[PDB]
Design a protein around this ligand. Sequence first.
Ligand code: K
Ligand code: K
Lengths: 255, 255
Amino acid sequence: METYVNKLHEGSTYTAAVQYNVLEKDDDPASLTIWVPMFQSSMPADLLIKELANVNILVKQISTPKGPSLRVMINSRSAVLAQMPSKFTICANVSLDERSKLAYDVTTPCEIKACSLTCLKSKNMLTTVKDLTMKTLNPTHDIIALCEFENIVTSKKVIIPTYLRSISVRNKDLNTLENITTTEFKNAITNAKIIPYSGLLLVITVTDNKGAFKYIKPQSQFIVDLGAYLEKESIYYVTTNWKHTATRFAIKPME
Amino acid sequence: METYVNKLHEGSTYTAAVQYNVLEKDDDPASLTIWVPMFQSSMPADLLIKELANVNILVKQISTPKGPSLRVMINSRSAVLAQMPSKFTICANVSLDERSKLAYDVTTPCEIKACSLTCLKSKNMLTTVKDLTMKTLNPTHDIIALCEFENIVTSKKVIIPTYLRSISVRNKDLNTLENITTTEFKNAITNAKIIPYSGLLLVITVTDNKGAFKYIKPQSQFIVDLGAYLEKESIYYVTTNWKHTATRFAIKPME
Ligand SMILES: [K+]
Ligand SMILES: [K+]
């Protein structure tokens, strides 16, 4: 099994962000990716990944008010994985590969092809997009991150534009935008990481609270979902073959 | 242009449920389907469809907290279509066909290939799945509608299972289920309609409020989204080629 460890946060207690790529144990197997609800651990990541790799996964496709969902079961957990959610539900459209299909309401064993563990800061130092929608007043502009990938098989470039937040900008600040797209903000976008979680997850390190980072807790990790953009993709194919090559941004007047 | 009128409700004032299948005006065109927020009209449907067919549609793909979305603009509206939403946003993953792609933030004219108008009861006589999630106490069972289609090109059968509601069932009622899956309920499922809206929309006529229909307003239309199940399909292909052949149900103990 292929394993991946990315120590974005290098403190002893951290938030584990775990994603498995799996394959139905059957002829004509469905292929799908499962991300586990975040949980805190204190076992060093290079040891925790060995435990994560040894679990057994079963899935069941079900119908919910939101549409098709996958019920996930994780067992064969070792003692440290008491820490880890073992029953939970994820979106089937994101999780399942293009052309991959599961019968409904049948508990289905899956073989693990790969396991990725990303270490993030503690939950109180994580900021979401939803968190920030409650932090603006009559905004004037949208901030979008432009996530650039190269498909290493085809050489094709791919841009995924992901919404970050809306803000209000003073007219005088528009001349250079320097009070909004501060040096801190620009460097944080340039150096942002995209890792295998929620399909893909953009992680921006918020180094202070000025301008485009206003009302964010300093030294937070601002995490952003890309999986909604991967519904029609195979997530395992994407995390194997889409090389993250750059992150840019756009500040757009709102519509 | 192909047009479709389904008079499910045959009163003079009705809720118009309108869906357009369109094609980007370009070489290598994207194909997509747009459904319009429901609105009330009193123009007879066989006349309103002529006005609906004459509109002009433009779309713009944008990024939002929920992922990729399509901003829709409708103009070339005649006087009666003052009644109709002319600017609104829908989910891009449902709307856009498999393998169909739009550049971001570019307002894009679309040619209308087909227009469907379905007449539903007035908004106060429509019941949603969300409405009913607030109408049960420690439920014991889920009710699922099993929507059966035949693909008329390939002859393949397709079942879309859609969640309706959860309910609590008395132990004594389980012997025959007759107090839950009443004669009224059974006939309403058998005779349910699926029409081109929200991708596809299941419409169940609620003929009374007993058993599986408890806490629903009598003579309501219980409307259920199938579009979440069509993300990886082409909606125009589906409404042209998936013939609705039956509707069944399952009452499942909850998990
Ligand atoms: K997918
Ligand atoms: K679709």
